[PDB]
């Protein structure tokens, strides 16, 4: 059982890692626009 919580919490943290990268991509577009 415990295996299926740990393996799940990995994927649900890698999902937030993917969200923070896309937020950084969006800021980079406004960054250049203000240069």
């Amino acid at each position: 059982q415990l295996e299926s919580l740990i393996n799940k919490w990995s994927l649900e943290l890698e999902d937030q890692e993917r969200h923070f990268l896309q937020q950084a991509t969006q800021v980079n577009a406004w960054d250049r626009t203000l240069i």
Binding site: S4, L13, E17, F20, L21, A24, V27, N28, D31
Partner: protein, 99 residues
């Protein structure tokens, strides 16, 4: 991953700003990945929990004590290598968006 990524340089954001006429950001237009690569550096893991094979409908049930140490090993690695780095990435995006 399609590439063996080496580790990036230590944190391009321990800068104090100085005003004469020009923006400190001009140097960060030269490489299109610049800010996203700094966030991808802050997120760079140095330990992870392995993917675990499920227990079988013929296995012996383990002592509770092994299961506590396996849980604390796993939650420590999540706290130290994911959660802390995601709040550091959040403070970096908060500092960048404000500027």
């Amino acid at each position: 991953l399609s590439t063996v990524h080496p580790a990036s340089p230590p944190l391009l954001c321990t800068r104090e700003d100085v005003e004469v006429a020009e923006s400190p950001l001009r140097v960060l237009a030269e490489t299109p990945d610049s800010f996203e690569k700094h966030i991808r550096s802050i997120l760079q893991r140095s330990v992870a929990n392995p993917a675990f094979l499920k227990a079988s409908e013929k296995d012996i049930a383990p002592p509770p004590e092994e299961c506590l140490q396996l849980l604390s090993r796993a939650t420590q690695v999540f706290r130290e290598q994911y959660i802390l780095k995601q709040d550091l990435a959040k403070e970096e995006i908060q500092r960048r968006v404000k500027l």
